[PDB]
Amino acid sequence: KPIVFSGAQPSGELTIGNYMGALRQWVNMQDDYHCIYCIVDQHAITVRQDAQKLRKATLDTLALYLACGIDPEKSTIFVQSHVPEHAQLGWALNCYTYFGELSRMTENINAGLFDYPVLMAADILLYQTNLVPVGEDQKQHLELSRDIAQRFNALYGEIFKVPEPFIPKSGARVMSLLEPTKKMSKSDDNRNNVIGLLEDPKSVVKKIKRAVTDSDEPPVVRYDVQNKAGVSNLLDILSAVTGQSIPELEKQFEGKMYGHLKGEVADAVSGMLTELQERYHRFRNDEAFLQQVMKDGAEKASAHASRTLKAVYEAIGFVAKRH
Amino acid sequence: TKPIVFSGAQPSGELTIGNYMGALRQWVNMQDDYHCIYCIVDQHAITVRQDAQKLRKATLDTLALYLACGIDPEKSTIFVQSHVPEHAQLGWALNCYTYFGELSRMTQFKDKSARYAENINAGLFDYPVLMAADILLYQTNLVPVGEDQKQHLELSRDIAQRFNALYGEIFKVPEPFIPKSGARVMSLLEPTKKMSKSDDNRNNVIGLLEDPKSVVKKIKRAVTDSDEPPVVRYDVQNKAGVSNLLDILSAVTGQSIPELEKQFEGKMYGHLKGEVADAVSGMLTELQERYHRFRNDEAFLQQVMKDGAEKASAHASRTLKAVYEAIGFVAKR
Ligand SMILES: Nc1ncnc2c1ncn2[C@@H]1O[C@H](COP(=O)(O)OC(=O)[C@@H](N)Cc2c[nH]c3ccccc23)[C@@H](O)[C@H]1O
Numbered sequence: 001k002p003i004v005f006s007g008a009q010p011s012g013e014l015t016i017g018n019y020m021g022a023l024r025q026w027v028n029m030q031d032d033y034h035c036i037y038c039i040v041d042q043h044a045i046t047v048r049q050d051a052q053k054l055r056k057a058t059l060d061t062l063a064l065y066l067a068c069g070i071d072p073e074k075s076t077i078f079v080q081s082h083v084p085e086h087a088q089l090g091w092a093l094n095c096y097t098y099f100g101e102l103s104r105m106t107e108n109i110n111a112g113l114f115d116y117p118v119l120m121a122a123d124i125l126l127y128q129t130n131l132v133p134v135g136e137d138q139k140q141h142l143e144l145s146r147d148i149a150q151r152f153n154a155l156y157g158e159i160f161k162v163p164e165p166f167i168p169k170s171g172a173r174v175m176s177l178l179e180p181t182k183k184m185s186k187s188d189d190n191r192n193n194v195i196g197l198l199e200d201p202k203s204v205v206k207k208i209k210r211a212v213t214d215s216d217e218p219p220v221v222r223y224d225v226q227n228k229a230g231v232s233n234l235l236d237i238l239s240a241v242t243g244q245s246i247p248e249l250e251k252q253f254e255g256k257m258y259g260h261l262k263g264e265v266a267d268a269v270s271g272m273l274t275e276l277q278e279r280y281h282r283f284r285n286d287e288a289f290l291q292q293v294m295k296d297g298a299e300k301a302s303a304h305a306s307r308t309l310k311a312v313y314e315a316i317g318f319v320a321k322r323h
Numbered sequence: 324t325k326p327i328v329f330s331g332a333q334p335s336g337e338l339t340i341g342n343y344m345g346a347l348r349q350w351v352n353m354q355d356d357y358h359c360i361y362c363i364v365d366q367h368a369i370t371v372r373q374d375a376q377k378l379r380k381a382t383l384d385t386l387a388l389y390l391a392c393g394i395d396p397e398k399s400t401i402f403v404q405s406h407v408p409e410h411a412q413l414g415w416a417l418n419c420y421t422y423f424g425e426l427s428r429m430t431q432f433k434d435k436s437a438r439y440a441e442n443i444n445a446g447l448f449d450y451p452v453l454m455a456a457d458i459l460l461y462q463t464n465l466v467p468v469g470e471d472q473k474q475h476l477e478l479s480r481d482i483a484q485r486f487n488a489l490y491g492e493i494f495k496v497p498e499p500f501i502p503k504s505g506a507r508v509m510s511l512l513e514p515t516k517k518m519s520k521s522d523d524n525r526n527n528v529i530g531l532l533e534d535p536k537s538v539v540k541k542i543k544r545a546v547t548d549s550d551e552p553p554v555v556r557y558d559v560q561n562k563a564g565v566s567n568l569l570d571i572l573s574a575v576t577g578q579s580i581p582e583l584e585k586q587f588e589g590k591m592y593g594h595l596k597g598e599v600a601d602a603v604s605g606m607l608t609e610l611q612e613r614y615h616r617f618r619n620d621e622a623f624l625q626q627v628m629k630d631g632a633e634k635a636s637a638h639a640s641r642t643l644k645a646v647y648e649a650i651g652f653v654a655k656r
């Protein structure tokens with residue numbers, strides 16, 4: 001099976017777009033690929049934050065990924081800082097990364113924020129990764145990882161796999177509620193544009209009620225991204241939740257107003273989130289289970305990472321550690 | 324418990340009399356008075372591109388050199404940097420508490436990027452942060468180094484204070500231990516330039532493993548000055564060569580500069596160079612005799628590395644655990 005690597009930020013407030021898009025896509029491919037999920041706490045600290053909140057956010061993220069369907073017996077899930085090899089390879093790869101390559105990435109800035117693309121390269125290359133599902137903002141970072149890998153391989157032989165982007169997109173379409181021309185993003189400052197995965201039925205109703213529609217007369221529930229972006233977004237959200245096709249929903253809402261659509265979307269989404277939240281709280285409140293998942297995952301990750309790091313260290317010429 | 328000493332040297336190039344005077348000499352003398360930890364910093368060495376076989380051999384050359392100088396593994400912890408993962412781990416963490424501007428303003432980064440224009444890599448830039456991690460891991464009180472590492476030391480103090488101010492008494496704020504003489508031994512044909520173990524012009528350098536005969540010839544050919552009459556007097560501005568020779572003589576013999584000036588009253592540069600050559604030739608012959616005894620004993624070198632990495636890891640793991648707890652990471656099971 002090809003090896004797939006994904007970094008999970010312990011701070012990202014995930015949305016229904018993240019879930020019904022990429023995450024649900026990947027949950028159903030855990031037997032097709034050897035999937036690795038790395039909770040990237042070492043990347044998180046490039047932005048200063050409260051220590052207690054970071055610890056909590058790491059465990060929140062773990063429980064949420066488990067709740068979404070990431071299975072720790074099928075896939076490898078672990079906390080980045082638990083595997084020393086990440087930092088070790090990161091330092092080594094700094095020495096095969098041009099300063100220029102980092103300065104070109106798209107004085108009071110901390111060095112972690114400057115240097116984290118090299119750590120990301122190490123994160124990926126440690127596991128002989130074949131595929132990396134990246135968003136547009138991470139394309140440059142992936143390209144650097146490929147250039148580092150090829151550069152190192154040209155000097156020392158085929159030590160790393162050259163990773164590839166995972167090209168196919170999920171197919172689910174979730175746009176911002178007050179700005180339906182742009183994608184619903186977990187990075188949005190305006191939280192009224194998004195539905196978070198831990199929101200209750202009342203919060204979801206409130207946000208869907210506010211969602212931008214059009215001034216068509218009569219109001220008509222039809223799919224048209226150009227002229228009816230808001231109504232189309234509501235249809236896409238509903239279709240993604242229920243599995244009903246757009247033409248099926250258009251027929252279902254024949255002669256109905258936008259109030260009735262919004263009510264059905266709210267109910268459908270909250271139906272989905274209530275089951276996700278049950279699983280989340282069950283996992284999140286079981287400290288023993290989470291500790292076992294992290295220990296097992298770090299052990300699996302470490303076994304693989306140590307093999308790659310040993311090959312790297314031998315290639316570079318370091319005197320082998322005496323155990 | 325005793326206060327802690329930490330210092331390191333790269334296994335790249337070939338250690339010079341400069342490296343001995345500025346650092347190793349002090350390392351040997353501090354072993355009873357403080358709890359001393361000395362490191363072969365192979366992860367720093369790879370910031371300059373080396374052949375893999377050269378790197379491995381140089382790591383073991385450096386280890387044998389420490390032993391030959393008088394670094395006793397029964398008194399001091401001696402280890403190879405890459406054998407202790409905590410250096411890399413803390414070095415990443417400390418990147419997040421170091422400003423880009425602090426690194427871009429470094430003299431060593433600018434001198435190194437000038438000399439290695441075709442390999443201005445991120446490791447060369449990030450060098451000082453790993454060095455800070457090297458020191459801070461061991462609750463280090465004293466860092467014996469040459470003058471050229473003063474700026475790197477200042478940063479490691481700033482990082483410790485900055486981190487401590489946020490999180491509590493996690494690190495000791497280390498202090499430099501720079502000797503009065505021999506802190507910055509200068510090149511023999513270019514006494515305004517520091518003596519460098521990676522100098523192309525070999526005649527600028529006195530190698531620790533160089534043939535003493537070759538070293539005595541280099542001393543005889545060292546540039547002095549046009550003073551008429553010749554006068555053996557300390558003046559770095561107008562008498563750089565003679566000053567460097569006096570500084571070398573002072574550092575080997577332990578005699579002060581005014582003592583040497585009185586000693587060479589009425590004498591000229593032949594006397595000075597004779598006495599310098601004698602002192603240095605004697606040191607290196609002895610040093611190199613001990614060296615081969617250690618260097619060819621692979622079982623002993625293996626044991627020293629094993630024991631040292633064990634002792635180091637115990638200290639480093641303690642510090643990293645406190646650092647990780649303070650910043651907010653979930654503790655490893
Ligand atoms: N011409 C000279 N005259 C007097 N002293 C000199 C001369 N040239 C070099 N030195 C000193 O020798 C030590 C080793 O040199 P390195 O280049 O390996 O030294 C270096 O490049 C360090 N960054 C290695 C290091 C890495 N981590 C550390 C932590 C603590 C102390 C030192 C380190 C150094 O103390 C250096 O000051």
Ligand SMILES: COc1ccc(C#N)cc1
Pocket residue numbers: 086087088089090091094115116118119122410411412413414415418449453456
């Ligand atoms: C590029 O990632 C890293 C940079 C520096 C260190 C260290 N020490 C570890 C990782």
